[PDB]
Design a protein around this motif. Structure first.
Motif, PDB file in Angstrom:
ATOM      1  N   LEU A   1       4.913 -16.881 -36.192  1.00 49.13           N
ATOM      2  CA  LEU A   1       5.335 -18.318 -35.875  1.00 49.13           C
ATOM      3  C   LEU A   1       5.891 -17.626 -34.291  1.00 49.13           C
ATOM      4  CD1 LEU A   1       8.735 -17.922 -38.310  1.00 49.13           C
ATOM      5  CD2 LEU A   1       6.421 -19.471 -37.847  1.00 49.13           C
ATOM      6  N   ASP A   2       5.119 -17.314 -33.477  1.00 49.19           N
ATOM      7  CA  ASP A   2       4.908 -16.526 -32.771  1.00 49.19           C
ATOM      8  C   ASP A   2       4.885 -17.156 -31.319  1.00 49.19           C
ATOM      9  OD1 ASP A   2       4.408 -13.374 -32.635  1.00 49.19           O
ATOM     10  OD2 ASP A   2       2.570 -14.516 -34.124  1.00 49.19           O
ATOM     11  N   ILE A   3       6.127 -16.681 -30.059  1.00 47.72           N
ATOM     12  CA  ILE A   3       6.400 -17.273 -29.065  1.00 47.72           C
ATOM     13  C   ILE A   3       5.506 -16.930 -28.054  1.00 47.72           C
ATOM     14  CG2 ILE A   3       8.206 -18.388 -27.498  1.00 47.72           C
ATOM     15  CD1 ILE A   3       9.538 -18.267 -31.121  1.00 47.72           C
ATOM     16  N   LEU A   4       4.895 -17.142 -27.462  1.00 50.87           N
ATOM     17  CA  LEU A   4       3.995 -16.557 -25.910  1.00 50.87           C
ATOM     18  C   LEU A   4       5.063 -16.588 -25.396  1.00 50.87           C
ATOM     19  CD1 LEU A   4       1.968 -19.640 -27.282  1.00 50.87           C
ATOM     20  CD2 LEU A   4       0.584 -18.098 -26.032  1.00 50.87           C
ATOM     21  N   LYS A   5       4.839 -15.084 -24.332  1.00 54.46           N
ATOM     22  CA  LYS A   5       6.124 -14.862 -22.763  1.00 54.46           C
ATOM     23  C   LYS A   5       7.896 -15.015 -23.213  1.00 54.46           C
ATOM     24  CE  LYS A   5       2.369 -15.232 -19.461  1.00 54.46           C
ATOM     25  NZ  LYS A   5       2.545 -14.068 -19.393  1.00 54.46           N
ATOM     26  N   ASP A   6       7.397 -14.841 -24.555  1.00 52.97           N
ATOM     27  CA  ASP A   6       9.392 -15.465 -25.041  1.00 52.97           C
ATOM     28  C   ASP A   6       9.823 -14.650 -26.390  1.00 52.97           C
ATOM     29  OD1 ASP A   6      11.906 -16.466 -24.340  1.00 52.97           O
ATOM     30  OD2 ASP A   6      11.259 -17.860 -23.107  1.00 52.97           O
ATOM     31  N   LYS A   7      10.752 -15.094 -26.868  1.00 52.10           N
ATOM     32  CA  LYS A   7      11.130 -14.616 -28.116  1.00 52.10           C
ATOM     33  C   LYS A   7      11.629 -15.684 -29.327  1.00 52.10           C
ATOM     34  CE  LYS A   7      12.082  -9.189 -27.591  1.00 52.10           C
ATOM     35  NZ  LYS A   7      12.538  -8.616 -27.404  1.00 52.10           N
ATOM     36  N   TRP A   8      12.265 -15.882 -30.369  1.00 48.22           N
ATOM     37  CA  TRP A   8      12.692 -17.212 -30.681  1.00 48.22           C
ATOM     38  C   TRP A   8      14.322 -16.917 -30.318  1.00 48.22           C
ATOM     39  CZ3 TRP A   8      13.641 -19.762 -34.372  1.00 48.22           C
ATOM     40  CH2 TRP A   8      15.223 -20.155 -34.972  1.00 48.22           C
TER      41      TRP A   8
ATOM     42  N   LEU B   1      16.464 -22.875 -30.901  1.00 44.68           N
ATOM     43  CA  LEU B   1      15.154 -22.714 -32.490  1.00 44.68           C
ATOM     44  C   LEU B   1      16.377 -23.233 -33.526  1.00 44.68           C
ATOM     45  CD1 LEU B   1      12.294 -21.106 -31.033  1.00 44.68           C
ATOM     46  CD2 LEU B   1      13.089 -23.607 -30.658  1.00 44.68           C
TER      47      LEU B   1
END
Lengths: 75, 379, 151
Positions: free
Chosen positions: C88-95, C99
């Motif tokens: 559940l990897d958000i590129l260049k950002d975090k949870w 969301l």
């Protein structure tokens, strides 16, 4: 109490940072941004084989004077 | 000046062709050095049963040291280095970024009809989303979770990304009222802008709402910008204002290299928007507040080719404000072409091959040999 | 429903009211932070006709932190590891709290239709996916029929 660490890359290029033991890993990445023009979101730092996580602190990995961090630029 | 534009486009075509065919080799790093350093960083990942040396090979097979960087910043440094030379890049580095104005006009007015290099750095506004009640006795800035709001009985503070405490200018009366109204256990340590919180429902929910309104107003004057993306745009001189093109060049973290960007021709596809069309998308990215349009434009401008429509959906929707910043400098085609030609001879000399794929593979096996030997001699 | 912020209560009710097509997600009786999830294999994917069981769990830090999710059924997918975990990897950002549970479920579902073996979690699987996509797809069809066609 300032101190100085090194950051090395796969090409062998080394840079020197002035940092505090309480400095967060995102402050280290912003200092790398200041020197190299590389956004924090496009950096990974490794010390002692382990990844330096955002929101933590240099002392949390026990990083001290003249330690060498490794800057990874491919992930 | 008919045929005048093609000496800049030759600069474009040469760097594009060389990055496409040579990948990480365009940085001019000898394969030996790459393998040696990869070795030192790799020692600890070795299995030290059996004949460790046969799992050293297992480590060298595991190596990805010749795959090109996918750091957007590093690719920008390499484009700057090739096109301006090491000293020109160092002077360009000293000049300041300009925040793209609302309509993009300051960037359009910074693109006279010469061969130009644009460097862009884009920031994302990384404001706090979380808060917690705490007693002053229990609050230690060094250890506490960072980028967070702390509501004390007599103070409201922001602990920023650098672990500094920023007072938010509230009276102790206001803080005492807010602290004592938020009593539910699962709202002691929670999020700031919950869409389900109703200020007309409860005294506690009005206090949570009011605190969010306070924090939001204060963050408007606090620097929460963190650099998220970096790229370059080559803008060759053209024969007529209305036929001028730009070519964006980028890598992107965990997504793609500049080699892959060039192989999918995204530089050419974006070039077809024209200068005003591209600038207008870039300018809208920063002025819009509709997370769906932000994500859609981000996707169109910066995804790897072909993923424009999935890149910023779902988990990767772009919820935070972005701000584009730019700097422009002139490119001497003779310097950029001489730079590229020195790299080409270096590659032809030290890594010969009949085609480019063979030179790349010779480079890779030389680096592997140097890694293998170094890891051998230190274990 | 007891002991929960309004947001988790309403996410739950709106998942039950308007479920994601192809996905069944219902909370456990004894624990409301735990969801028993069943995702159907998308059509025209190697997993079609399968029915994959997963566990979705809201830790104490939800929604400040992402849900934990795990596959319970074995599945031959380059982005699911031997223990059922997903990227559940958000590129260049975090949870972010922007969301939701629904977003996580739609992403898993989409990922079953769009395997990504270049940024992998299951390496053996990803290697064969990049190298021999045809053979990887056949094996996944076989895994689907062996593991995911009667629970």
């Amino acid at each position: 109490s300032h101190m100085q660490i090194f950051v090395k890359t796969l090409t062998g290029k080394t840079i020197t940072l002035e940092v505090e033991p309480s400095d967060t890993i995102e402050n280290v990445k912003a200092k790398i941004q200041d020197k190299e023009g590389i956004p924090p979101d496009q950096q990974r730092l490794i010390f002692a084989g382990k990844q330096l996580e955002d929101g933590r602190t240099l002392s949390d990995y026990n990083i001290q004077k003249e330690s060498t961090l490794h800057l990874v630029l491919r992930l | 000046p008919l045929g005048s534009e093609k000496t800049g486009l030759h600069v474009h075509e040469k760097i594009k062709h060389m990055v496409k065919n040579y990948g990480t080799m365009i940085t001019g790093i000898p394969a030996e050095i790459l393998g040696q350093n990869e070795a030192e960083i790799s020692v600890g990942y070795v299995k030290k049963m059996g004949n460790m040396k046969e799992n050293i090979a297992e480590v060298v097979r595991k190596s990805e040291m010749t795959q090109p960087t996918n750091s957007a910043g590093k690719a920008s440094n390499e484009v700057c280095d090739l096109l301006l030379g090491t000293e020109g890049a160092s002077e360009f580095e000293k000049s300041s970024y300009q925040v793209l104005s609302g309509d993009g006009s300051n960037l359009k007015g910074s693109l006279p009809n010469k061969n130009l290099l644009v460097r862009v750095e884009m920031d994302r506004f990384n404001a706090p989303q979380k808060y917690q009640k705490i007693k002053r006795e229990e609050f230690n800035p060094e250890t506490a979770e960072k980028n967070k709001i702390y509501l004390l009985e007599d103070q409201l503070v922001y602990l920023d990304i650098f672990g500094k405490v920023i007072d938010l200018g509230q009276t102790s009366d206001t803080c005492h009222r807010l602290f004592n109204a938020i009593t539910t256990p699962f709202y002691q340590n929670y999020i700031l802008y919950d869409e389900y919180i109703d200020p007309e429902e409860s005294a506690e929910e009005a206090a949570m709402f009011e605190m969010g309104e306070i924090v939001k107003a204060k963050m408007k004057n606090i620097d929460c910008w963190t650099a998220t993306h970096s790229f370059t745009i080559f803008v060759p001189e053209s024969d007529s204002e209305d036929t001028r093109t730009l070519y964006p060049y980028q890598a992107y973290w965990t997504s793609h290299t500049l080699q892959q960007w060039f192989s999918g021709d995204k530089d050419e596809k974006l070039s077809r928007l024209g200068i005003d069309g591209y600038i207008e998308k870039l300018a809208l990215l920063g002025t819009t507040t509709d997370s769906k349009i932000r994500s859609s434009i981000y996707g169109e401008l910066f995804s790897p080719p072909g993923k424009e429509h999935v890149f910023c959906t779902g988990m990767n929707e772009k919820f935070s404000p972005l701000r584009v910043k730019f700097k422009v400098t002139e490119v001497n085609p003779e310097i950029a072409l001489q730079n590229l030609e020195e790299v080409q001879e270096f590659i032809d000399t030290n890594y010969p091959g009949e085609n480019a794929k063979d030179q790349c593979e010779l480079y890779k096996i030389k680096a592997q040999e140097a890694m293998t030997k170094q890891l051998e001699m230190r274990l | 429903m007891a002991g929960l912020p309004r947001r988790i209560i309403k996410e739950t009710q709106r998942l039950l009211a308007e479920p994601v097509p192809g996905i069944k997600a219902e909370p456990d009786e004894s624990n409301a932070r735990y969801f028993h999830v069943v995702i159907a294999g998308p059509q025209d994917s190697p997993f079609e006709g399968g029915t994959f069981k997963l566990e979705l769990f809201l830790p104490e830090e939800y929604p400040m932190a992402a849900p934990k999710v795990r596959f319970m059924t074995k599945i031959y997918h380059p982005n699911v590891d031997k223990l059922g975990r997903i990227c559940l990897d958000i590129l260049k950002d975090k949870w972010s709290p922007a969301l939701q549970i629904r977003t996580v479920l739609l992403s898993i579902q989409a990922l079953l239709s769009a395997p990504n073996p270049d940024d992998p979690l299951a390496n053996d699987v990803a290697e064969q996916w990049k190298t021999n996509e045809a053979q990887a797809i056949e094996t996944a069809r076989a895994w689907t029929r062996l593991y995911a066609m009667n629970n």
